[PDB]
Amino acid sequence: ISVRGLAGVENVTELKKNFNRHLHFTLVKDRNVATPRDYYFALAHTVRDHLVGRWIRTQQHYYEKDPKRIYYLSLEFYMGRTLQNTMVNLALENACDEATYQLGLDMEELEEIEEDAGLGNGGLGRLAACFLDSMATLGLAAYGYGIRYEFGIFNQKICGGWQMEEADDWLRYGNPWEKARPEFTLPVHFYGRVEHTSQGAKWVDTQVVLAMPYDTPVPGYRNNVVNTMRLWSAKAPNDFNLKDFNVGGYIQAVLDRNLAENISRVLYPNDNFFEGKELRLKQEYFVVAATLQDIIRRFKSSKFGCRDPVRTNFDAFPDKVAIQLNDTHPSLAIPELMRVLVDLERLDWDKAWEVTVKTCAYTNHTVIPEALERWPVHLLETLLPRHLQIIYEINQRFLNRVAAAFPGDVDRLRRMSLVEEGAVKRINMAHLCIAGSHAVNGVARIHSEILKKTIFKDFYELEPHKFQNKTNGITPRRWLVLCNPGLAEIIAERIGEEYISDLDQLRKLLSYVDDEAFIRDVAKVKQENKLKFAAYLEREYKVHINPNSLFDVQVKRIHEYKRQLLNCLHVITLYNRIKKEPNKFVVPRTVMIGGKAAPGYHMAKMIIKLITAIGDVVNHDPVVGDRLRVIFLENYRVSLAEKVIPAADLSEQISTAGTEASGTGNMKFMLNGALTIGTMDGANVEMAEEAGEENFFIFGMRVEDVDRLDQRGYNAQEYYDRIPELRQIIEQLSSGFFSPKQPDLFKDIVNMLMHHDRFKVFADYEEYVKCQERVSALYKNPREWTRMVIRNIATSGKFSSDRTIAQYAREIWGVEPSRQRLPAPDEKIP
Amino acid sequence: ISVRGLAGVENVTELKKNFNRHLHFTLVKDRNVATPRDYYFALAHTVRDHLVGRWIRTQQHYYEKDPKRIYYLSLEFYMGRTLQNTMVNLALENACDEATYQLGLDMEELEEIEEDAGLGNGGLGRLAACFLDSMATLGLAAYGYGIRYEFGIFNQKICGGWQMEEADDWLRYGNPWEKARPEFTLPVHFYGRVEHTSQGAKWVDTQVVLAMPYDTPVPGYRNNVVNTMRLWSAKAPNDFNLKDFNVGGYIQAVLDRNLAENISRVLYPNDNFFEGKELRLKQEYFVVAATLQDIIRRFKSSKFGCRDPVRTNFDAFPDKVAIQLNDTHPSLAIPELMRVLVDLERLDWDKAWEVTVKTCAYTNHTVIPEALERWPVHLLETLLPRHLQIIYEINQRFLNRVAAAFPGDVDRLRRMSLVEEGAVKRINMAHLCIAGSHAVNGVARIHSEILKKTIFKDFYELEPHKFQNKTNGITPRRWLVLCNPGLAEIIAERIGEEYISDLDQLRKLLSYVDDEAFIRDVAKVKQENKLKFAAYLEREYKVHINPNSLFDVQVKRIHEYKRQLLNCLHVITLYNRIKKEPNKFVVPRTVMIGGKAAPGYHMAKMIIKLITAIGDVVNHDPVVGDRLRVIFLENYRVSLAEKVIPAADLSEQISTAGTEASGTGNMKFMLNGALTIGTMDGANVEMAEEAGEENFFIFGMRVEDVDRLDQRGYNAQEYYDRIPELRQIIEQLSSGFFSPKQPDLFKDIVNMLMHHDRFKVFADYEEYVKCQERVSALYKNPREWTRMVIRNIATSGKFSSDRTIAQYAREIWGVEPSRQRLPAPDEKIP
Ligand SMILES: O=c1[nH]cnc2c1ncn2[C@@H]1O[C@H](COP(=O)(O)O)[C@@H](O)[C@H]1O
Ligand SMILES: O=c1[nH]cnc2c1ncn2[C@@H]1O[C@H](COP(=O)(O)O)[C@@H](O)[C@H]1O
Ligand SMILES: NN1C(=O)N[C@@]2(O[C@H](CO)[C@@H](O)[C@H](O)[C@H]2O)C1=O
Ligand SMILES: NN1C(=O)N[C@@]2(O[C@H](CO)[C@@H](O)[C@H](O)[C@H]2O)C1=O
Ligand SMILES: *Cc1c(COP(=O)(O)O)cnc(C)c1O
Ligand SMILES: *Cc1c(COP(=O)(O)O)cnc(C)c1O
Structure with a gap:
């Protein structure tokens, strides 16, 4: 069994x-x-x-x-x-x-x-x-x-x-x-x-x-x-x-x-x-x-x-x-x-x-x-x-x-x-x-x-x-053996069971990186995981997703420093590009954002509303079809994490360099077969260092760049002025494109983004969507995507x-x- | 066993x-x-x-x-x-x-x-x-x-x-x-x-x-x-x-x-x-x-x-x-x-x-x-x-x-x-x-x-x-077999076990009323019960009592209608008579009064203080010796009841006729070998009727007499005027004989007793102490006391x-x- x-x-x-x-x-x-x-x-x-x-x-x-x-x-x-x-x-x-x-x-x-x-x-x-x-x-x-x-x-x-x-x-x-x-x-x-x-x-x-x-x-x-x-x-x-x-x-x-x-x-x-x-x-x-x-x-x-x-x-x-x-x-x-x-x-x-x-x-x-x-x-x-x-x-x-x-x-x-x-x-x-x-x-x-x-x-x-x-x-027990028995089994089939209490042994999987059966298997469990989650979704929450698309997920508490807003900007960009050239092919994605906002954190609660607002528009546009879905994962908690992480393809760890002390969700995704797109922040650095920067999707400012910008003074208007795609999104938010009945609903977000963004969201925008294009490119090549996955898993041992x-x-x-x-x-x- | x-x-x-x-x-x-x-x-x-x-x-x-x-x-x-x-x-x-x-x-x-x-x-x-x-x-x-x-x-x-x-x-x-x-x-x-x-x-x-x-x-x-x-x-x-x-x-x-x-x-x-x-x-x-x-x-x-x-x-x-x-x-x-x-x-x-x-x-x-x-x-x-x-x-x-x-x-x-x-x-x-x-x-x-x-x-x-x-x-299970296994055993030795769920069968004990062994046994278990309670007392509460004295107990909630005050008046009378003729013999008694007062019931709490005040005086008078002890049973509750009732000789059920709906403590005492001194109130009437008034110590006004007095108008002064012993007690309370440091401590009790006694305590005083003399007389004759006891027990079946x-x-x-x-x-x- x-x-x-x-x-x-x-x-x-x-x-x-x-x-x-x-x-x-x-x-x-x-x-x-x-x-x-x-x-x-x-x-x-x-x-x-x-x-x-x-x-x-x-x-x-x-x-x-x-x-x-x-x-x-x-x-x-x-x-x-x-x-x-x-x-x-x-x-x-x-x-x-x-x-x-x-x-x-x-x-x-x-x-x-x-x-x-x-x-x-x-x-x-x-x-x-x-x-x-x-x-x-x-x-x-x-x-x-x-x-x-x-x-x-x-x-x-x-x-x-x-x-x-x-x-x-x-x-x-x-x-x-x-x-x-x-x-x-x-x-x-x-x-x-x-x-x-x-x-x-x-x-x-x-x-x-x-x-x-x-x-x-x-x-x-x-x-x-x-x-x-x-x-x-x-x-x-x-x-x-x-x-x-x-x-x-x-x-x-x-x-x-x-x-x-x-x-x-x-x-x-x-x-x-x-x-x-x-x-x-x-x-x-x-x-x-x-x-x-x-x-x-x-x-x-x-x-x-x-x-x-x-x-x-x-x-x-x-x-x-x-x-x-x-x-x-x-x-x-x-x-x-x-x-x-x-x-x-x-x-x-x-x-x-x-x-x-x-x-x-x-x-x-x-x-x-x-x-x-x-x-x-x-x-x-x-x-x-x-x-x-x-x-x-x-x-x-x-x-x-x-x-x-x-x-x-x-x-x-x-x-x-x-x-x-x-x-x-x-x-x-x-x-x-x-x-x-x-x-x-x-x-x-x-x-x-x-x-x-x-x-x-x-x-x-x-x-x-x-x-x-x-x-x-993180513990390989709950975060691997418990939530992902399928992956644990195939790993055990090749290298034994001693790795559960000695995660470094996962390195031995490196020698199967060109193994045809293993690549097929690693790819199979992930497909089985995505199918099971896609099912749970309709079971307990109800309204379909496509298991063939790339599962783009960001699950963690809602914070301005975690930049769920930057994820939002990308999602809207994808939408706008599709609406511009409808009959052009793009890698399908289901982007899932989940997390809780502290009751008194007004901005954080405003962001949750923005995410659901984007989904209302995006999820009901006939021209988009099944190429893009925006889903807000409700009541994110440990038990829910044990379900999404094993089913994820892309892990989002995009905090402003120097703000996320370490993070641990990132490690959970790495050991479960997801590829990481993120900034050189917290443990992301040690993870890229362990797997090789070639097997990681790093983008944005490093800590040094953030400080340089602060000396200089951060002016978001500059970015708004030089990037038309960014400009188009801000004016969409400002005019009620995402909130028809209440056109000024998101004025606080826009106002903040343009005048008091402590986490310079705009500064990392260009390099973020550019980097996102690179992961889409690689997802189009199943064999190479899985091989990069094996490079991450095999190298995550240090994070136990x-x-x-x-x-x-x-x-x-x-x-x-x-x-x-x-x-x-x-x-x-x- | x-x-x-x-x-x-x-x-x-x-x-x-x-x-x-x-x-x-x-x-x-x-x-x-x-x-x-x-x-x-x-x-x-x-x-x-x-x-x-x-x-x-x-x-x-x-x-x-x-x-x-x-x-x-x-x-x-x-x-x-x-x-x-x-x-x-x-x-x-x-x-x-x-x-x-x-x-x-x-x-x-x-x-x-x-x-x-x-x-x-x-x-x-x-x-x-x-x-x-x-x-x-x-x-x-x-x-x-x-x-x-x-x-x-x-x-x-x-x-x-x-x-x-x-x-x-x-x-x-x-x-x-x-x-x-x-x-x-x-x-x-x-x-x-x-x-x-x-x-x-x-x-x-x-x-x-x-x-x-x-x-x-x-x-x-x-x-x-x-x-x-x-x-x-x-x-x-x-x-x-x-x-x-x-x-x-x-x-x-x-x-x-x-x-x-x-x-x-x-x-x-x-x-x-x-x-x-x-x-x-x-x-x-x-x-x-x-x-x-x-x-x-x-x-x-x-x-x-x-x-x-x-x-x-x-x-x-x-x-x-x-x-x-x-x-x-x-x-x-x-x-x-x-x-x-x-x-x-x-x-x-x-x-x-x-x-x-x-x-x-x-x-x-x-x-x-x-x-x-x-x-x-x-x-x-x-x-x-x-x-x-x-x-x-x-x-x-x-x-x-x-x-x-x-x-x-x-x-x-x-x-x-x-x-x-x-x-x-x-x-x-x-x-x-x-x-x-x-x-x-x-x-x-x-x-x-x-x-x-x-x-x-x-x-x-x-x-x-x-x-x-x-x-x-009351249930013969908890109130007999559970709290008094000794009595239950000797009864079972003669008439079997079917009486536990058919209490009427206790009537068969009537034919052992002249049985020498039975009288000796009934008397033995009661002595064993008194010894065990006297021990518990020093164990858990500490300061000696004499197991040979008559165990006079009144345990029920503290109320003006229950007349713990009337019990008090008798206790003080016994004391005063002893102090008057020290070298005259009197049947020794341990009078135990216990019960809780509702937190907001001022009078009831005042009565509790009076009881302990009487004990302070009485219990430390050298001339009294071991002839009279006044003890207030703390935290009276079901579990405590299972201990005192089997050890009681005299049960006090002295409420003003027409005020105690039925009462059930009275029944508990009757089935456990205690003799009852009380008024023709509640179930007391049916109990005396079942055992025979000759085997009961009834005294005081009947309901009719109470009503006659109310038509007339109740004047306590009359009683105070015609009974010197009663007068002596009221003036003892009034002058601080029982409360030296605070001489006016009991003014509310006296004031109430003389001007607003809704339960005419004084009206039943004379007939109460007179009746109390009769039980003392009978206690002096162990054989006849026990025989009257057997008449009560044998006739308590109706009260199951x-x-x-x-x-x-x-x-x-x-x-x-x-x-x-x-x-x-x-x-x-x-
Ligand atoms: O005085 C002692 N005698 C014997 N065993 C003890 C004694 N004190 C603790 N233990 C044992 O040590 C365990 C640790 O209890 P602790 O004080 O909650 O750490 C207890 O459940 C017992 O098995
Ligand atoms: O629909 C039913 N099928 C079978 N047994 C039932 C059913 N409803 C109640 N019972 C039984 O009746 C007992 C009485 O439950 P009550 O509704 O709490 O009185 C239950 O514990 C079951 O043994
Ligand atoms: N709430 N919270 C913090 O206050 N600090 C946190 O601690 C964890 C555990 O060390 C770190 O991984 C997070 O980066 C950090 O934000 C965290 O999650
Ligand atoms: N608290 N309390 C009442 O209000 N009524 C009581 O009910 C019991 C049970 O019927 C009777 O035996 C008491 O005489 C009566 O005072 C009683 O004990
Ligand atoms: C691991 C975990 C976290 C931490 O996530 P980060 O991405 O480091 O903020 C938060 N919530 C749950 C339920 C977790 O399992
Ligand atoms: C039986 C019982 C009562 C009732 O006593 P009465 O003398 O009828 O007032 C009250 N308290 C306890 C703990 C009892 O067992």
Whole structure:
């Protein structure tokens, strides 16, 4: 059937009876009233049974051996569905497929019923998920720590061409994967004041919110390791949230508990944008405070909570603990670790600071200013008074370091301060992370260099040793074996299965680049993938596409820096050229644009409307026929990505050079047989470098050119003046060609494009359509297109998150990865 | 060990491995980290497994045979713990005891970990629970329908002698008994307006709240019948509760969902008191609207949703459906049933009314005016506009009936109206229930007569056939076999086990009233019970009592009509007599008073303070010694009741004649070997009548005497003037003898007692202490006390809820009870 494992005789039988046990005993249903949703749950529970045994021994193991623990703190974990992924990592896919078949059910139909765990916005959240899978696969004692939002990223609905947001109640029917651990509930403080008494400061008169943990299993790939993702939920204490007496109302007091519990209710839908709301800051301290107590507790036990030197010496803390800050979101972990060590454990400042710097590491994910976290001091002052005091003291000491290193450099001092003066004083979270971490890293080679040369130049001059790079990657498991079994099988037919956990081995496919059967096969799976997606489209969304055309897709969050608008300009150009010479042949294309816009991002929502507006015109023009279709992919999410990416021919990664930190979608397309058209931005550079620029479609300004243009001054009118085709499009938008009933509908886009384009869309227009002509030319030659595809796939190995994690492990965390199978799952009950 | 069933070889082994399966697979724990709470859950899950098989076949059975269905609507279901009860009804107690013993665990210790399902206030809620158990035991196709509050009756804490209320988060660790059924979620409407168009009225522009059902199993006693209790939970729709666009905030919209979900958040803590809050009215319509849709759906399928006459003829509705209104709380079911039949199904008014009256029945539980539900019209007008219109039309037609029957009786017309004019117009819910039901019943013979003679006299003259009586009862399972296995065993040793489901057989114990061994045994179990309670007391609450003294207990909600104050007056009298003649012998007593006061009931909370104040003085007076102890039983609830009642010698049922509708605690004490001192009120009359007045300690005014006194006018000063002992107590309270630091602390009590005592406490004082002397005299003669006890126990059979339900079944619902074992639980998987 494929190498989705063995469909053993004893195990298919075993699976079937357990499926039935659960349908009866767990779901309390009988075959005569069971619906597909019930069947999905029976299976889910049956599969989950197979990893509890391993989950328990993995955790017990780490307790016995006591290795250095890795704590990945992130406010986002974009997990997606977990049924198939679990089957894949446990080699259970074919057995389950067989068994459910024998029970007369279609497994694929059941898999479609599982709701996505959308606890993320985009790249940042998905990176965390990929990392977790890799850390488990490489046998690291790692823990993912985050917030269990009851409402994840909103589900997007297109009404009249506009995006409509609606609550993502992903828990409505329950989550069979999580395990509530109310017994490990912890208290988290807010507000209050600071008392300075005799021997130390005291954080007093605080409001208490309880953090209840929920553990979800993270299985490694076929190695019997099952790590843990611990998500915190906010709960109100039953005392003060009722007991602070003297009139108000008993009923009202009980209803008001949903005020402390609102902390974990919803994820902020902002991608690469900072909103200084109090609720967000509360979420940030909440995850940090709860997690740290859990970390220290585990450390207090270790082998120190037995003997060792005997005296809670936190000197070995950094040798046993490593906490990674996914962006500045969990940045309060720094002053919080200090508060506990100094205020509660009573360590002197300097010893505490040494420990803190040695255990914390920070990862930066963007250079755009509006995404930078700068919290107003009056907010921290009210909500976390002691932390503010600690931050000021950290700043005081750090700046003294600077003064000593650069005597008399008074501007450098203000530039480097963690405290920003002006309208309202703010705390630069990024500056805090750099000062309190022993390593700072970018997510792509160019991004990392940009940090050193630009944004964090002064900090680099101060401590050059802190700055590193760790190019992002994706998991070959979910992003290849899971979503594209067809491609995985044909690769395995030639080079084996060891590449799934050693992606570099894909290089061996280079020697099949002239193999006639392989070229035919690679081309076949892609055709099968396109046919399946074209079908899904009519199934779930309804109104035809042509599977023979080139599948041109751009799927990622809607942003001005991602330039979906530049993609739009090209689409309209194709249309206009067709309308000019109707009877001239052109390579057919289905351009699919999908992504979500943050609710308050007006421009982004305007762009979504533009895309659907273009499709209204283009898709109903008889002269165009089936040569050009414009489709907006609704509710883009992880599960939808697993469907489009394997069916894509052209991947669009056209951000303005220097704005996309790394990107990861690009890597997903490369490993799945799509050719890439893009700019020398983020990881695109390393991808072209790995596959050879001849096998990549690069165009546009490089970072240097962008800067040259900024010195000069960017004037879009120039481009409008010298390119008639560009002029024609802008006047089409301006006159209502794309919006008849509301002719001035797109005035904001045009106005922006002509007067305040921060991402110089026009500057890359000419070179973009010129480059687009080149890919069309090559698509006309199936054999050569596929051969270039094989050059990309065969060379994408470097982009596996296993590589990324192994680097973090060795160069930052100080631990050694291991592909050693944990001693089976085997029963056991001590 | 006792007749807690057989501890079979095959089943103890089976139990043990399933206990282990769950500890591993369900709880995801290993013996080395498992806590008593984990062990409790493993067991709970193991026991729950045994009744799913029966639950499924019972429900399937009713679907096949299609009998008349009974729907018990109540806003309260005081269930208590459910582990032991389930073991008892499934004959699993000894097997579980053995198995857990073999696993090295104490079952009793684990049972103490289960949280009480406190979804009730007192008697009314507990009656519903007892009824459910009886309906399942008598093989009736009955369904309990209510609200799944996430916060039940508050947990009571005594701080400085005052009651402190704190949220009862009973779901904190989860509920292993319930089964969420998100797939049967239903929509419920609120607000909106009424459109009168061509062919009918339309309820339009409403706010939608979703009702998600949770089913809990209700096993009959050893008959394999497992009925269902369906509790509704409020959920916000994800559309409008987000989709009603045009600025407000996406985050805020999501946080505001906890506005529609507040409907099922907390139970109103009022016992016998009406609070006209909007949230309450919403809860009332919520449970009614959701339930009715469920009822009709089931009816539409029946055997009509196949064939029968073919044409949705609702003429057979009353033959297939019976809905019982537990008090007026679910009274909206009447106009709601009309709204659906008329507005949606399009039946003419008269046919709809005939159906409605024929399927609904109402049970009244109190005669005090302040407990009567009178909803302001402006509230119904805004929240349920169409229902108000229906109520007015029902009133219009009903009053025309009256006018026709009593021509010219203009005062009768206003008196009987469902609409009350005055300050603000109100709707008399009780009047609505009588008009729209074919049966109205009281809960005790005297209470029922009072309804006919007083409160509902006019309605009785109009339709005498509607009025009936159904004396309350309690379940011998939880209230005898479960809480008092020792007594149950010795009874079973002489007369067998058939009495558990046929309590009348207890009469056979009359012939052992002179049996020397039996008297010794009855006396022994009571001594063992007192020793165990005396121990629990020091265990969980701490500060000694004497097990040899007479256990004088009064446990019920704190009310002015229950007269805990009269009990107080007696206690103080005993104290004063001891202080007057210290070296004179008196029968030792431990008087235990326990109960909760509604949060806003100032007087009730003042009484709690008085009780603890008396104990402070009495319990620390050296001259008193161990002759007199005053203890306030904290957090009285079902589980606590199962502990005190079996250990009680004297039961206090001293409400003012004519105020306690029936009472059920009194019955609990009678069947557990306690002697009763009380007034001729509620069921006390039928109890004395059943056991013989010679075996009861009756005192005080009868209903007649109370009325005579009211004609005359009640003047408490008279009693104060003629009784020196009474005078001495009032002046002790007035001068601060019981409250040194705050001498005027109890001025409200004294003031009330002397000038506004609605329950004439002083009037029954003399006859009360005189009667108390008589019980002390009899306690001095152990042999005769026990013999009188045997006379009570042997004669309590009439007070089993099996009798009550059989009467409802035959005289109101029109169904026949059956003690037929359902065809085993046996596997099966169709
Ligand atoms: O005190 C202990 N005795 C034995 N095993 C322990 C103890 N503490 C932790 N463990 C084991 O280590 C696992 C790790 O628990 P953690 O504290 O959540 O990391 C637990 O599930 C147990 O298997
Ligand atoms: O359409 C049907 N076919 C077969 N069995 C049914 C059907 N509807 C209800 N049942 C059975 O009747 C039980 C009663 O379901 P209820 O509607 O919740 O009362 C179900 O759990 C099934 O066993
Ligand atoms: N939202 N979001 C960011 O703020 N930064 C991002 O992080 C990911 C993961 O490192 C990078 O690949 C993206 O280029 C970057 O934009 C991202 O996706
Ligand atoms: N709260 N509450 C009432 O409002 N009425 C009550 O109902 C129960 C059950 O019928 C009766 O036994 C009580 O006497 C009556 O007070 C009761 O306990
Ligand atoms: C991989 C992924 C992303 C990141 O895409 P980029 O193109 O790097 O912005 C965003 N959303 C989803 C659902 C993803 O799978
Ligand atoms: C039986 C019961 C009641 C009813 O007691 P009465 O004396 O009839 O008021 C109240 N509370 C609990 C916990 C009960 O078990």
